[PDB]
C-alpha cells in the first residue's frame, strides 16, 4: 500500500558518487513510527515523502 510520510532531519548524503540522501522520516497515522530512508535528488526539510512499501529500513555505508 502507498503511504505518505514526513521527514524530520537529514542524516546525510550517501552513495559512491554522493547520489542519494539518507534522511530520517516518520508517519502521520501514528506519531511513533520512525525509519531511515534513502531519497536521491534535492531534498530539504519540509517535503512530504512517499513509500511504496514500509517494511525495511534503508542502510548504506
Amino acid at each position: 500500500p502507498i503511504k505518505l510520510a514526513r521527514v524530520t532531519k537529514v542524516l546525510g548524503r550517501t552513495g559512491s558518487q554522493g547520489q542519494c540522501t539518507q534522511v530520517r522520516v516518520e508517519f502521520m497515522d501514528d506519531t511513533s513510527r520512525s525509519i531511515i530512508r534513502n531519497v536521491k535528488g534535492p531534498v530539504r526539510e519540509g517535503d512530504v515523502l512517499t513509500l511504496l512499501e514500509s517494511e525495511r529500513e534503508a542502510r548504506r555505508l
Binding site: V10, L11, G12, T14, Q22, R59, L61
Partner: peptide
C-alpha cells in the same frame, strides 16, 4: 569506544565541504 566504532561504520559521514562556485550603480 566499541559502540562508537560500530555506529560510525553504520552511518554515513556528512557535514563540512566548502564548494566555491559561481546592485546600486
Amino acid at each position: 569506544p566499541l559502540a562508537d566504532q560500530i555506529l560510525a561504520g553504520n552511518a554515513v559521514r556528512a557535514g563540512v565541504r566548502e564548494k566555491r562556485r559561481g546592485e546600486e550603480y
